[PDB]
Design a protein. Structure first.
Length: 114
């Protein structure tokens, strides 16, 4: 619900919105193992009616040099749902300053709702 500092889970995305990292909190808050996601896409669990807009957030990723999506519904491991908002950050490669990975901060407004 409202307020909870420990309700956050880091993740990193490939420029194709694929999971390369997620913090173990994910299993607490959604029930996914970080690695269950690693190799797939976040758009898979995005609430469809938000997934488009969510994608546009990545389509932007330039306003502040960064983009932060709104509180959306993410599919829960066991077929429910959950509330978290994702902040996506371009992490560039120090050599050429080319976006190699996305620093994504996910934090839940609420735990699963089945």
């Amino acid at each position: 619900g409202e307020f909870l500092d420990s309700k956050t889970f880091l993740s990193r995305f490939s420029m194709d919105m694929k999971f390369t990292y997620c913090d173990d909190r994910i299993t607490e808050l959604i029930g996914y193992h970080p690695e269950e996601l690693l190799g797939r896409s976040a758009s898979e669990f995005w609430h469809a009616l938000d997934s488009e807009n969510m994608t546009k957030s990545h389509q932007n990723l330039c306003t502040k040099g960064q983009v932060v999506s709104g509180q959306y519904r993410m599919l829960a491991k066991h077929g429910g749902y959950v509330w978290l908002e994702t902040q996506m950050t371009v992490i560039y490669n120090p050599r050429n300053l080319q976006p190699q990975c996305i620093m994504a901060v996910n934090y839940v407004l609420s735990e699963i709702e089945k």
